[PDB]
Amino acid sequence: KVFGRCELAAAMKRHGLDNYRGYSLGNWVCAAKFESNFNTQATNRNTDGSTDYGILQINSRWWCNDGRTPGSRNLCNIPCSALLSSDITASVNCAKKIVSDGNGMNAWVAWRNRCKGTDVQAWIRGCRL
Ligand code: NA
Ligand code: NA
Ligand SMILES: [Rh+]
Ligand SMILES: [Rh+]
């Protein structure tokens, strides 16, 4: 599923991300835009052999089991395929554990490089929330 900007903002707010660990909703929308272009089906291979899945590009090195990442963990206790659903529940619940892991949203290299220190409120401007 390819979300609209405001549709994804509303789904993220309904699932508890607005100000989660102090990150405003625009941060999460900005991260999703640069990670997946709001596409739940997005997949990308990493140099280490792990893969990033879904709207927030959650990695198989730590967070999910894809059956092909050796010496990895599954800290969200999910198959990676769950992160590709039109229903963003698994991605949201796994993002909350990631952002709680010590480095905040710096866990998402795209957030640190494209959203941190920018006017992220712009990502939710005009949305009925
Ligand atoms: Na990415
Ligand atoms: Na894994
Ligand atoms: Rh939902
Ligand atoms: Rh509202």
UniProtKB/Swiss-Prot annotation:
One of its GO terms (biological process) is cell wall macromolecule catabolic process. Its EC number is 3.2.1.17. Residues 1-129 form the C-type lysozyme domain. It is found in: Secreted. It holds the Pfam family Lys. Keywords: Allergen, Antimicrobial, Bacteriolytic enzyme, Disulfide bond, Glycosidase, Hydrolase, Secreted, Signal. Substrate binds at D101. It catalyses: Hydrolysis of (1->4)-beta-linkages between N-acetylmuramic acid and N-acetyl-D-glucosamine residues in a peptidoglycan and between N-acetyl-D-glucosamine residues in chitodextrins. In the egg white and polymorphonuclear leukocytes. It comes from the Eukaryota. SUPFAM superfamilies: Lysozyme-like. It is an enzyme of class 3 (hydrolase). GO terms for molecular function: beta-N-acetylglucosaminidase activity; identical protein binding; lysozyme activity. GO terms for cellular component: cytoplasm; endoplasmic reticulum; extracellular space. SMART domains: LYZ1. Disulfide bonds join C6-C127, C30-C115, C64-C80, C76-C94. InterPro entries: Glyco_hydro_22, Glyco_hydro_22_CS, Glyco_hydro_22_lys, Lysozyme-like_dom_sf. The active site is at E35, D52. Belongs to the glycosyl hydrolase 22 family. Monomer. Lysozymes have primarily a bacteriolytic function; those in tissues and body fluids are associated with the monocyte-macrophage system and enhance the activity of immunoagents. Has bacteriolytic activity against M.luteus. This is Lysozyme C.
